[PDB]
């Protein structure tokens, strides 16, 4: 059952790090989208 | 007439190169804004 | 019946532990590559971040020397 405990800890930290990673690219992508929208807005005001 | 002149400061101010200087400052700030916005557009597209 | 439905629901209840051994080993492998990929991801994110910082500084300097040009 020690191997089973190793497995369960394995998937819990694996899914936690996947959640952290995915929120990282989500937030950086939303920042990049905001930057592109601002660039378009300032280009329209030129 | 003199009374009406007296109470209003704006008319007495109304009553010539400064306008040209203001136009020059407006156009130079406009062109520097255009240049910096062009630089931002060029840089952000990567 | 809860005893029966819990005893048969144990992953690995009907799976031999040695293929768990290979799956765990390859899990740590693909883990090694996934933090590696996160290393390149974070380094290029920081690269674009200080590109953004450099353009911020240049734009701020332009504003400052333009509004003090008159």
Swiss-Prot record, chain A:
Keywords: Activator, Nucleus, Transcription, Transcription regulation. GO terms for biological process: negative regulation of transcription by RNA polymerase II; positive regulation of transcription by RNA polymerase II; positive regulation of transcription elongation by RNA polymerase II; positive regulation of transcription initiation by RNA polymerase II; regulation of transcription by RNA polymerase II; RNA polymerase II preinitiation complex assembly. One of its GO terms (molecular function) is transcription coactivator activity. GO terms for cellular component: core mediator complex; mediator complex; nucleus. Its main location: nucleus. Coiled coil: none annotated. It is found in: Nucleus. Belongs to the Mediator complex subunit 7 family. Component of the Mediator complex, a coactivator involved in the regulated transcription of nearly all RNA polymerase II-dependent genes. Mediator functions as a bridge to convey information from gene-specific regulatory proteins to the basal RNA polymerase II transcription machinery. The Mediator complex, having a compact conformation in its free form, is recruited to promoters by direct interactions with regulatory proteins and serves for the assembly of a functional preinitiation complex with RNA polymerase II and the general transcription factors. Present with 7598 molecules/cell in log phase SD medium. This is Mediator of RNA polymerase II transcription subunit 7. It comes from Saccharomyces cerevisiae (strain ATCC 204508 / S288c). The lineage of its organism: Eukaryota, Fungi, Dikarya, Ascomycota, Saccharomycotina. The chain holds residues 169 to 214 of 222 of the full protein.
Swiss-Prot record, chain B:
Disulfide bonds: none annotated. A motif (Nuclear localization signal) lies at residues 33-46. It comes from the Eukaryota. It is found in: Nucleus. Belongs to the Mediator complex subunit 9 family. Component of the Mediator complex, a coactivator involved in the regulated transcription of nearly all RNA polymerase II-dependent genes. Mediator functions as a bridge to convey information from gene-specific regulatory proteins to the basal RNA polymerase II transcription machinery. The Mediator complex, having a compact conformation in its free form, is recruited to promoters by direct interactions with regulatory proteins and serves for the assembly of a functional preinitiation complex with RNA polymerase II and the general transcription factors. Present with 1364 molecules/cell in log phase SD medium. Component of the Mediator complex, which is composed of at least 21 subunits that form three structurally distinct submodules. The Mediator head module contains MED6, MED8, MED11, SRB4/MED17, SRB5/MED18, ROX3/MED19, SRB2/MED20 and SRB6/MED22, the middle module contains MED1, MED4, NUT1/MED5, MED7, CSE2/MED9, NUT2/MED10, SRB7/MED21 and SOH1/MED31, and the tail module contains MED2, PGD1/MED3, RGR1/MED14, GAL11/MED15 and SIN4/MED16. The head and the middle modules interact directly with RNA polymerase II, whereas the elongated tail module interacts with gene-specific regulatory proteins. This is Mediator of RNA polymerase II transcription subunit 9. The lineage of its organism: Eukaryota, Fungi, Dikarya, Ascomycota, Saccharomycotina. The chain holds residues 101 to 149 of 149 of the full protein.
From Swiss-Prot, chain C:
The keyword Heme does not apply. It is found in: Nucleus. One of its GO terms (biological process) is RNA polymerase II preinitiation complex assembly. Keywords: Activator, Coiled coil, Nucleus, Transcription, Transcription regulation. Residues 15-55 form a coiled coil. GO terms for molecular function: RNA polymerase II-specific DNA-binding transcription factor binding; transcription coactivator activity; transcription coregulator activity; transcription corepressor activity. GO terms for cellular component: core mediator complex; mediator complex; nucleus. Its main location: nucleus. Present with 1391 molecules/cell in log phase SD medium. Component of the Mediator complex, which is composed of at least 21 subunits that form three structurally distinct submodules. The Mediator head module contains MED6, MED8, MED11, SRB4/MED17, SRB5/MED18, ROX3/MED19, SRB2/MED20 and SRB6/MED22, the middle module contains MED1, MED4, NUT1/MED5, MED7, CSE2/MED9, NUT2/MED10, SRB7/MED21 and SOH1/MED31, and the tail module contains MED2, PGD1/MED3, RGR1/MED14, GAL11/MED15 and SIN4/MED16. The head and the middle modules interact directly with RNA polymerase II, whereas the elongated tail module interacts with gene-specific regulatory proteins. Belongs to the Mediator complex subunit 21 family. Component of the Mediator complex, a coactivator involved in the regulated transcription of nearly all RNA polymerase II-dependent genes. Mediator functions as a bridge to convey information from gene-specific regulatory proteins to the basal RNA polymerase II transcription machinery. The Mediator complex, having a compact conformation in its free form, is recruited to promoters by direct interactions with regulatory proteins and serves for the assembly of a functional preinitiation complex with RNA polymerase II and the general transcription factors. The gene is SRB7. The chain holds residues 71 to 140 of 140 of the full protein.
């Amino acid at each position: 059952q020690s191997r089973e405990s190793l497995i369960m800890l394995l998937e819990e930290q694996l899914e936690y790090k996947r959640g952290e990673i995915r929120e990282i690219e989500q937030v950086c992508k939303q920042v990049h989208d905001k930057l592109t929208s601002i660039q378009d807005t300032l280009r329209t005001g030129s | 007439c003199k009374s009406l002149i007296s109470e209003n400061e704006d008319t007495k101010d109304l009553l010539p190169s400064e306008w040209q200087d203001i136009i020059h400052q407006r156009e130079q700030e406009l062109q520097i804004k255009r240049d910096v916005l062009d630089d931002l557009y060029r840089k952000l597209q990567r | 019946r809860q005893i029966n439905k819990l005893i048969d629901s144990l992953p690995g209840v009907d799976v031999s532990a040695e293929e768990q051994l290979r799956k765990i080993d390859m899990l740590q492998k693909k883990l090694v590559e996934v933090e590696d990929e996160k290393i390149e991801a974070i380094k290029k994110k920081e690269k674009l971040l200080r590109h953004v910082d450099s353009l911020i500084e240049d734009f701020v300097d332009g504003i400052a020397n333009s509004k003090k040009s008159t």
